[PDB]
Design a protein around this ligand. Structure first.
Ligand SMILES: CCCCc1nc2c(=O)[nH][nH]c(=O)c2[nH]1
Ligand SMILES: CCCCc1nc2c(=O)[nH][nH]c(=O)c2[nH]1
Ligand SMILES: [Zn+2]
Ligand SMILES: [Zn+2]
Lengths: 372, 372
């Protein structure tokens, strides 16, 4: 296959369905990417992740550069080899988490300095170092290093951050291109910022398109602005991005959000909601999510979801999983996570199928009526 | 298959190898039984447990009667259906754990009263109620309800407890036989007591043989007396039990203990050591156990064990598992537990093969030289 080739096979309104071809495999879009926090998709073997239907997973750079170490993983043969996943892997830049989990972060035009929330040790992450770390990990889709603008944000603050991210985007681009092996085997995604402001989003989009990237992400929307607000921003933001390249909405994962996002032109998604919902007891069903810990499920012999075709719904009951979660057993988290990720992949498949068949709008309507 | 049929195919010294045929399947002996504490073999799907080579697992009655409830599991279709394991299941009587984990236990000739270490609720466990609970769970091999004698124990105290357990054994036997469906589809094992005293062990054995059971367990030896002492007791205790029936050493699982126990006539084993060793970081190898958390394994690309043929040793390195455990990831516990249980099953296979080939004594010598 080629280094990177995105092809749109069908459309309906702003929705698109197609594929991204990469050296390690093909990614069907719209796509949902399970998240591997510390080089592991929580409670699942890589084969199980693939069995759910996932074509690609997301690796968190921040965590990896700390816990095991970028240099160490490279010496061990790279992330794919390390964790046993041989398909594409998209890694975030680490910038976001550094501004969330890290402590005593010092930001400048050069990058960000911070103390690990583990060893308390210091680190200086920059566009150049972020790109290098993602290379060391052997990432297939590299995210440009940026600064996620806090919500709410004033027009001036949002402008400054956006302008800086755009400057950092250029640096990421040049850093990526100078590394021959990386530039030739991996792809680079730029990230649009600008908060909820249209003019800022347009400037960011022009600058990003000006730089030129393999894909474009809509950043800064996984900040708690509400679905209505998020949708509003997506309405005018996605059209600004180049149409012939993937559109990746970072950190958005609720099912209804995904459907609405695809209706607005998004091709890629990622979220820990599915995995975290494995331990908290939240299981996704076509009739809406349920909390398996609820007493009403203690003797429910039915599977998590009546239609889901995942291995969990074929073999175990709600009653058993209810028991497992309340008892704090690891198997509970394993079964809940496999189901939820399988559910998500089934959702993406139904979206891809309905787009290819020109009945996505109807699917969305049907989905919402039942889900809510 | 029959309700229960134990056949010895080969011998060497006191060691035996053969099979136990039961309705739900055949059990190869000597056998190692993975433990399912709360209706789950820690961090493993039933299929994975079977994939390691296990022919039977052990279910803990104490825990089950509390967390999910005996009556509830029966209404849900039984333990096999509940957890998804369709092969034989041996359940302990619950008496032991009640004297270990429980609180405010009141003991009498009728049974034992206690408060759950969970809800603090009270319960009265007796030979009759224990047998009933194991029936409700759908246990294939039922353990007689007894009183595990504390170590150290004076001759008089050990005698009284043993004599009482023998009285309880008769009650278990009658309770089991009165329940037609149970008596016809499940087996009942009596448990020998008597602490470290030969005459007490002999009395217990005669009484147990007098009652008549499908198998005989050597109880009271998983109390911290030391391998030397345990071996000493096994030397004169096992020969006391009927030769044509299985000999089950309860709670003994260290590899060297298993080998030495088989050399002394034991056919069945069980232990949480393998599972608990999954989280603590202890991995069994033919060169002795190792603690995967040790820094020397951070960049070790080799599998947990150079010879092990389990799925974990084929796919992941010590370096990766080292990372997983120190990072506290669920996958770490999953991989460590699959390997350790697979290692145990490989041990049992090597024991069965060496017995059938009349070279077990040599195998034991070779095993120890390398293991230690
Ligand atoms: C918990 C939600 C994470 C979503 C996210 N947004 C962003 C963004 O806007 N810029 N860069 C990033 O790595 C990033 N990650
Ligand atoms: C943690 C070790 C458990 C071993 C055990 N011994 C015994 C025994 O001697 N009698 N009855 C039992 O259930 C039992 N379980
Ligand atoms: Zn399912
Ligand atoms: Zn192994």
């Amino acid at each position: 296959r080629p280094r990177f080739s995105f092809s749109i096979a069908a459309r309906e309104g702003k929705a698109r369905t197609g594929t991204i071809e990469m050296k390690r495999g093909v990614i069907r879009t719209p796509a949902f990417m399970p998240v591997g926090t510390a080089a592991t998709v929580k409670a699942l073997k890589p084969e199980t992740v693939r069995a759910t239907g996932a074509d690609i997973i997301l690796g968190n750079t921040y965590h990896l550069m700390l816990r095991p170490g970028a240099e160490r993983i490279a010496k061990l043969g790279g992330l794919h080899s390390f964790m046993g996943w041989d398909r594409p892997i998209l890694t975030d830049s680490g910038g976001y988490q550094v501004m969330s989990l890290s402590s005593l972060t010092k930001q400048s035009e050069e990058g960000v300095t911070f103390k690990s929330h583990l060893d308390g040790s210091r680190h200086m992450l920059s566009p150049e170092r972020s790109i290098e770390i993602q290379h060391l990990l052997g990432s297939d889709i590299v995210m440009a290093f940026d600064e996620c603008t806090p919500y709410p944000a004033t027009p001036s603050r949002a402008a400054s951050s956006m302008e800086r991210s755009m400057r950092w985007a250029k640096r990421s681009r040049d850093a990526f291109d100078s590394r021959k092996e990386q530039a030739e085997n991996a792809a680079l995604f730029g990230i649009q910022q600008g908060s909820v402001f249209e003019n800022l989003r347009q400037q960011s989009a022009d600058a990003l398109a000006e730089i030129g990237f393999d894909g474009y992400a809509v950043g800064g929307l996984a900040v708690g602005e509400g679905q209505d607000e998020m949708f509003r921003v997506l309405d005018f933001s996605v059209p600004m991005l180049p149409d012939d390249k993937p559109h990746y909405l970072m950190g958005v994962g609720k099912p209804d959000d995904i459907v609405g996002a695809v209706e607005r032109g998004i091709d890629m998604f990622d979220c820990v909601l599915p995995t975290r919902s494995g331990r908290n007891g939240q299981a996704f069903t076509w009739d809406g999510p349920i909390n398996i810990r609820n007493a009403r499920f203690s003797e429910d012999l039915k599977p998590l979801d009546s239609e889901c075709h995942c291995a969990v719904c074929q073999k175990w009951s709600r009653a058993y999983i209810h028991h497992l979660i309340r008892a704090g057993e690891i198997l509970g988290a394993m079964l809940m996570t496999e189901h939820n990720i399988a559910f998500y992949q089934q959702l993406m498949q139904k979206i891809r199928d309905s787009i290819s068949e020109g009945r996505f709008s109807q699917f969305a309507q049907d989905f919402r009526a039942r889900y809510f």
